[PDB]
Design a protein around this ligand. Structure first.
Ligand SMILES: CC(=O)SCCNC(=O)CCNC(=O)[C@H](O)C(C)(C)COP(=O)(O)OP(=O)(O)OC[C@H]1O[C@@H](n2cnc3c(N)ncnc32)[C@H](O)[C@@H]1OP(=O)(O)O
Ligand SMILES: O=P(O)(O)O[C@H]1[C@H](OP(=O)(O)O)[C@H](OP(=O)(O)O)[C@H](OP(=O)(O)O)[C@@H](OP(=O)(O)O)[C@H]1OP(=O)(O)O
Lengths: 160, 95, 665, 155
């Protein structure tokens, strides 16, 4: 595998992974916006032949009413290349990128209830905590957990 | 509640007034910047001023224009840059 | 007025007239010397004008102005110093960039790009052990990268393979959770140490149960003996495992779960799929099915063993049940849609893809709104395979249309990117939008597009919106076809099929110097490509047969370039030399057998004599070439041969039983 | 607990046909689709069991009201041949026992079984399912046309 930084000329194929892996689809101008505004926190996982196999496209949510924090928008990898320890490596590389560039107080995402493997991986291994159950989030009609993770211990481990 | 980034690009196009920087003696820099800029402008002017006195024949130019299909400006550059001869100019456009 | 000149600057950076934008931006400078956007424009302009060493001191004296402001925030000048180290890195001034980041390392907030700048400048300036410490710090930083490990390899400069693998053995010891340190020794190593390394690698990845490990090992199936020793090792594992319920009766460990048996059966079944013997693959996947009928990946490779064979419909009917096991993720029904489109089923693939889409419109328009290039290009190729052209030509036109949209999109954010302070991703996306049309999906659509335009021209019968029956029946397809082909020709040239379709699209226009320069730019890369070789054959065939119907200016240059590249020979002996130097290559043999009938139709008895050889010593003898030789036999380019094609397909069906194109009708 | 790879799982709306494909093959009789409609809305009362993250076992149950009691009947047990005593029966049968005990307001549990599989009734009598009823000609097309009924009480 390979985990590396978000070069913009790559990212216009990882949307091809989006349309092939997870149903929540986005506009490409969203990708060109979050490829220039914060290029550090989003990462791309590849294999040898240059084919895209996984990505994290993330976001630092700008909110002046409280402390600044991050917001994971998309995590995906292919089912043909799964169960190798990809998603946790991409997620904590993105987390350490956030804590090394602009001090992420907490991270947050939204995940549906019907999936079990992703729910397990966010739940016990990478240790998210369920903070709010938001009703009727996705289009197909499933309620979604709004998960959060505290990164103060990660901040004091990377500050040493 | 899913917005799909509708308000993400709205404040990209917002109106704002940009900041002001205190003037502190930039003239000593921009003097040598303008001198270097006038040097490359003198070179880039001297290119077209030395190659401006080149005769142009019409039939060979229209034959090249029929046979490789670009605009007239780049073909005129390529024909003035090859000393008015058609053959090695066609070789260089073929290379 | 200032808005008119800002609009002029944006429309001149739109149409890429560079120094006019520079002149009107120096008009802003003698209008006002204090804006940042002038300095951003100067940085991007002399990055794309490639003058760097003076831009070094110019960005230094711009850095001088912004340090004294009391209301200032740190991230902008941090990435400004990063863009400065980037432009001094590409400047060639290596010691200057090194001393600059050593002086301004403490004025940052991003350690990452400062660290790669130090690493690359320590790779460049020959300093070895400090760069080794830098890349050890990167390995402790990120344990997973090709470039970091390769830079550490070429920095430490290993004398032999053993000291090279010592690096990955110590990387095994302190970092056991990583993946590519368990993989990179399997690339270059050979022998018994390679055998005993892959042994414990697949033992761990089969005890834990990693599916795509075969995918990693299909990076290394270009060697012959490695495949044989892996296959002998795996069959030894199972012949020991179905007798005493362990990997081998030498050691004594904890007894494995019984899923390991079917998991290794899965691995070897896909291994027999790769080496091209599907009979043993069925004989073992039958026991794999009778062990457990419920896991998805076993039936997925049950589809793949038929997809790599000829028959595509059996793969479709097994794989529809395989995806009908669960309806949770978009991956398995996306591959179901792909396999149904390659199974010559359009309505079932449409109703299959329409499940996970939004239920407010049709499926194809919904994936057109979200720019699904994959489905559109692949069903365009499938609709070409249904032997009619209209909506495939339509889909090629609208994928190039949203290419026009994605190349026009950039006008909106430049005010925010002169309001924000980020420059190196900005110069990289301006650099990508210079060269945006080099993506392989565009070429994958354009090759079948140009193919159907030339096939339609050779054998004839609130912007613009498309209906197929008017838009497929343009009175001359060639001028709009070369309009769609010319960015593919101007932007990417390292692949020979671009210039070869340029040859095929100039063959019916008869522009002979464009013809010959596409010949030259295709010949400068590869000279022994067969389809390019018969392009050469038709080239000097029409040269020696049409040396009189052209003007005197083209005569001299055509003759001297032909003297340069070609010489003076006939087609017959040249094709004879070509068929003798490729006397074992079956696509090259078909390629010569085409022109041995084309140059003279009376030698057709030789052609069947030339393209019927079937011995085991042939290179690249798969079902692709056999389907190609029967398709080229029935295309009529070689002759009408219904007296030997039946015995040739009856002989090929005995060597390939599981193909649908070799079934007896 | 450690070293083993057993986890239970809920029957969701998207995972119906895998439940179909397992219980078409684990037991030789097959019933119509309203069985599979009945096993859906019960929620946490009917679940399946994954060994090494592939589906192996299943238990679905019902609620009965007959013979002056408020009764529970486990509808089917599901398991395969080469996986015996390797991760199916004991632990998720104890799971249906402890959901029955975390509710605890019911009377009894009971089961129908064939007469020919003596290892099965041994494995049920390892937990306390005593034999009280031997019904004659209960099965309709199989060779052991007879059946036993096993039962434990709660209160
Ligand atoms: C926007 C959002 O994030 S939510 C809405 C969309 N969400 C997503 O797209 C993410 C989930 N979607 C996917 O398609 C997933 O990526 C999947 C299904 C391919 C799974 O991805 P994976 O590559 O298997 O993740 P990963 O590489 O980390 O798997 C390894 C680890 O995952 C964990 N894991 C969690 N669940 C399981 C499970 N059922 N089985 C096996 N491992 C699991 C384990 O800790 C495992 O480690 P192990 O080898 O010691 O057992
Ligand atoms: O990576 P891409 O260029 O987008 O295409 C690949 C490739 O298909 P093509 O080479 O025909 O374009 C693979 O084909 P193979 O080389 O593996 O035979 C295919 O896998 P299969 O056809 O074998 O099923 C699948 O690759 P993967 O399954 O790893 O994603 C597919 O990817 P896409 O679905 O994105 O097109």
């Amino acid at each position: 595998m390979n985990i590396r930084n978000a070069r913009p000329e790559d990212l216009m194929n990882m949307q091809h992974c989006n349309l092939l892996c997870l149903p929540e689809n986005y506009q490409m101008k969203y990708y060109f916006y979050h490829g220039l505004s914060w290029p550090q926190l989003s990462y791309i996982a590849e294999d040898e032949n240059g084919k895209i196999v996984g990505y994290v496209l993330a976001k630092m949510e700008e909110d002046p009413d409280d402390v600044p924090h991050g917001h994971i928008t998309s995590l995906a990898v292919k089912r043909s290349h799964r169960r190798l320890g990809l998603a946790q490596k991409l997620m904590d590389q993105a987390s350490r990128a956030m804590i090394e560039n602009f001090n992420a107080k907490y991270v947050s995402l939204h995940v549906r209830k019907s999936n079990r493997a992703a729910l397990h991986l966010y739940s016990n291994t990478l240790n998210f905590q369920i903070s709010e159950v938001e009703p009727k989030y996705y289009a197909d009609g499933e309620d979604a957990y709004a998960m959060k993770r505290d990164l103060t211990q990660m901040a004091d481990e990377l500050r040493r | 509640k899913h917005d799909s980034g509708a308000a993400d690009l709205e404040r990209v196009t917002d109106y704002a007034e940009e900041k002001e920087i205190q003037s502190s003696n930039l003239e000593t820099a921009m003097s040598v910047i303008g001198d270097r800029r006038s040097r490359e402008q003198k070179a880039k002017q001297e290119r077209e001023k030395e190659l401006a006195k080149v005769t142009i024949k019409k039939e060979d130019l229209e034959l090249i224009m029929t046979e490789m299909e670009i605009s007239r400006a780049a073909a005129e550059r390529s024909l003035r840059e090859h000393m008015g001869n058609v053959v090695e100019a066609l070789i260089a456009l073929t290379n | 007025n200032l808005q008119i000149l800002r609009d002029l600057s944006l429309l001149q950076i739109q149409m890429r007239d560079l120094e006019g934008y520079r002149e009107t931006r120096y008009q802003l400078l003698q209008l006002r010397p204090a804006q940042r956007a002038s300095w951003i424009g100067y940085a991007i302009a002399y990055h794309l004008l490639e003058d760097y060493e003076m831009a070094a001191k110019i960005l230094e004296e711009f850095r001088k102005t912004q340090q004294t402001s009391p209301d200032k925030v740190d991230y902008e000048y941090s990435e400004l110093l990063l863009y400065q180290n980037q432009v001094l890195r590409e400047a060639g001034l290596y010691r200057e960039a090194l001393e600059h980041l050593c002086t301004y390392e403490k004025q940052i907030c991003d350690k990452l790009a400062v660290e790669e700048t130090k690493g690359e400048l320590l790779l460049q300036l020959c300093r070895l052990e400090d760069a080794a410490d830098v890349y050890r710090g990167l390995q402790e930083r990120n344990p997973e990268n090709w470039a970091y490990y390769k830079g550490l390899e070429k920095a430490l400069k290993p004398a032999n393979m053993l000291e090279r693998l010592k690096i990955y053995e110590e990387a095994w010891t302190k970092y056991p959770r990583g993946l590519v340190p368990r993989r990179l020794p399997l690339n270059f190593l050979s022998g018994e140490k390679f055998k005993e390394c892959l042994d414990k690698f697949l033992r761990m990845n089969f005890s834990k149960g990693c599916p795509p490990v075969f995918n990693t090992l299909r990076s290394l199936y270009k060697d012959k003996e490695k495949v044989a020793i892996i296959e002998e090792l795996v069959v030894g594992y199972e012949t020991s495992l179905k007798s005493c319920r362990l990997f081998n009766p030498n050691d004594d460990g904890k007894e494995e779960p019984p899923t390991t048996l079917l998991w290794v059966q899965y691995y070897l079944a896909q291994h027999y799929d790769k080496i091209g013997q599907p009979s043993i693959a069925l004989e073992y996947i039958n026991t794999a099915i009778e062990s457990t009928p419920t896991l998805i990946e076993l039936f997925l490779v049950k589809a793949k063993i038929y997809k790599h064979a000829g028959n595509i419909k059996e793969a479709a009917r097994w794989m529809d049940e395989a995806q009908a096991l669960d309806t949770a993720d978009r991956f398995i029904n996306s591959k179901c849609a792909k396999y149904m489109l390659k199974a010559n089923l359009i309505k079932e693939a449409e109703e299959m893809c329409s499940k996970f889409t939004r239920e407010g419109t049709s499926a194809v328009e919904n994936l057109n709104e979200m720019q699904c290039m994959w489905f559109q290009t692949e069903c365009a190729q499938a609709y070409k395979a249904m032997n009619k052209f209209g909506e495939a030509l339509k889909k090629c036109h609208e994928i190039e249309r949203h290419f026009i949209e994605i190349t026009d999109d950039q006008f909106d954010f430049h005010t925010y990117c002169m309001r924000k302070i980020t420059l190196r991703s900005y110069v990289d996306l301006l650099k990508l939008e210079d060269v945006l049309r080099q993506h392989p999906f565009y070429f994958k659509a354009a090759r079948i597009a140009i193919e159907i335009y030339l096939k339609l021209h050779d054998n004839p019968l609130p912007k613009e919106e498309l209906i197929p029956e008017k838009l497929a029946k343009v009175e001359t397809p060639l001028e709009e076809a070369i309009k769609f082909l010319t960015p593919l020709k101007n932007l990417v040239k390292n692949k020979i099929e671009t210039h070869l379709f340029a040859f095929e699209i100039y063959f019916r226009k008869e522009k002979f110097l464009l013809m010959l320069q596409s010949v030259k730019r295709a010949f400068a890369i590869d000279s022994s490509h067969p389809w390019l070789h018969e392009c050469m054959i038709r080239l000097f065939n029409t040269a020696v047969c049409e040396s009189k119907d052209l003007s005197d200016t083209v005569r001299t240059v055509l003759k001297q370039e032909m003297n340069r590249l070609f010489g003076a020979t006939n087609p017959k002996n040249f094709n004879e030399t070509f068929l003798k130097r490729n006397s074992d290559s079956l696509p090259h043999r078909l390629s010569a057998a085409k022109m041995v009938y084309y140059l003279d139709p009376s030698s057709q008895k030789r052609a069947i004599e030339l393209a019927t050889t079937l011995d085991e010593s042939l290179t690249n003898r798969n079902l692709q070439t056999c389907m190609e030789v029967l398709e080229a036999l029935y295309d009529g380019s070689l002759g009408d041969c219904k007296e030997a094609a039946e015995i040739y397909r009856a002989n090929c069906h005995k060597l390939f039983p599981y193909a649908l194109a070799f079934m007896p009708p | 607990m450690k070293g083993s790879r057993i986890e239970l799982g809920d029957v969701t709306p998207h995972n119906i046909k895998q439940l179909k494909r397992l219980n078409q093959v684990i037991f030789p009789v097959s019933y119509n689709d309203k069985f599979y409609k009945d096993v859906l809305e019960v929620g946490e009362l009917a679940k399946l069991a994954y060994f090494n993250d592939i589906a192996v076992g299943a238990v679905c149950c019902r609620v009965d009201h007959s013979q002056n009691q408020k009764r529970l009947y486990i509808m089917t047990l599901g398991c395969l041949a080469p996986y015996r005593r390797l991760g199916i029966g004991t632990k998720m049968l104890n799971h249906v026992l402890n959901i029955c005990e975390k509710d605890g307001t019911f009377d009894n549990i009971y089961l129908h079984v064939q007469i020919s599989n003596e290892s099965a009734i041994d494995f049920y009598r390892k937990f306390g399912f005593e034999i009280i009823e031997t019904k004659k000609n209960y099965y309709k097309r199989i060779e052991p046309a007879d059946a036993h009924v096993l039962q434990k009480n709660l209160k």
